[PDB]
Design a protein around this ligand. Structure first.
Ligand SMILES: C[C@@H](NC(=O)c1c[nH]c2ncc(C3CC3)nc12)C(C)(C)O
Length: 278
């Protein structure tokens, strides 16, 4: 169905928290015999008008999204958002656990898939606003999908950037400088963040060389310091054993001015080529 009755959705466990919402593992069990399919169900835990309306927009964004590389909308219940459940979890944990199996080629396959999904999102005029390996899900050994559209905004036809009034609440190390300074978000700031996702992929989300840990190594409010470092042209170093051509792609995504960063549609072919030569 595209409309699920709540009485048929049976709670199993919590999948995650964040942005005043929660994602739960539920079984859709209209027969009530534990034979129904599993689904991920997002609900708000706050009745305030601003976040209800936000959550409604999130449901409409995802509903209108159709891509092998984007978590699938399944329907709603009335208040709750019903999505496909991916038991393999987020790519961040997947990379940490299967490190020894996943070679460079594989990482480049994941990279190309995220890029393809972001190119599509771009065409819908959708800014994701929170790209990070924690928000990428694993469909299979050779298939990933972008998720968490809790902060995603649709760009008006007349603008190509979005300005957020309140400060961001995500780890600061995935933010573009223009986001840090002016809360400007666009498809090009998504490109910046995708640079960090590339870094996460090629460090297999290892905690010791995380964006977090590397900043503390490079060393006043942390946010200002981060802006300073990036202003000087300090960047994250090549992940250990990273192919040079991949690191250069990262640095391109980390171009100080948004209009100097490659598009996802330009990034895509490069990744596919690197993957075919690995
Ligand atoms: C991106 C968010 N996840 C989702 O929206 C999900 C949608 N279907 C899913 N299936 C499995 C998972 C496992 C990782 C738990 N997360 C999700 C969240 C931040 C809760 O992981």
């Amino acid at each position: 169905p595209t409309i699920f009755e709540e009485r048929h959705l049976k709670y199993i466990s919590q999948l995650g928290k964040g942005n005043f919402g929660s994602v739960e593992l539920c079984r859709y069990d209209p027969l009530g015999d534990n034979t129904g399919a599993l689904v991920a169900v997002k609900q708000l835990q706050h009745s305030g008008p601003d976040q209800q309306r936000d959550f409604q927009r999130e449901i409409q964004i995802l509903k209108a999204l159709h891509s092998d590389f984007i978590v699938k909308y399944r329907g709603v219940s009335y208040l709750r958002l019903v999505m496909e459940y991916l038991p393999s979890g987020c790519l961040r944990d997947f990379l940490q656990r299967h490190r020894a199996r996943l070679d460079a080629s594989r990482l480049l396959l994941y990279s190309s898939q995220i890029c393809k999904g972001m190119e599509y999102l771009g065409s819908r005029r959708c800014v994701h606003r929170d790209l990070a390996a924690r928000n990428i899900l694993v469909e299979s050994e050779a298939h990933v999908k972008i998720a968490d559209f809790g902060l995603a905004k649709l760009l008006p036809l007349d603008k190509d950037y979005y300005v957020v009034r309140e400060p961001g609440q995500s780890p600061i190390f995935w933010y573009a400088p223009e986001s840090l300074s002016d809360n400007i978000f666009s498809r090009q700031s998504d490109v910046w963040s995708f640079g960090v996702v590339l870094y996460e992929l090629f460090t297999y989300c290892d905690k010791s060389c995380s964006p977090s840990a590397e900043f503390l190594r490079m060393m006043v409010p942390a946010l200002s310091r981060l802006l300073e470092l990036l202003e000087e042209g300090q960047r994250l170093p090549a992940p250990p054993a990273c192919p040079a051509e991949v690191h250069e792609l990262m640095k391109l995504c980390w171009a100080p001015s948004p209009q100097d960063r490659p598009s996802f549609s330009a990034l895509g072919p490069q990744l596919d080529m690197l993957w075919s030569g690995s």
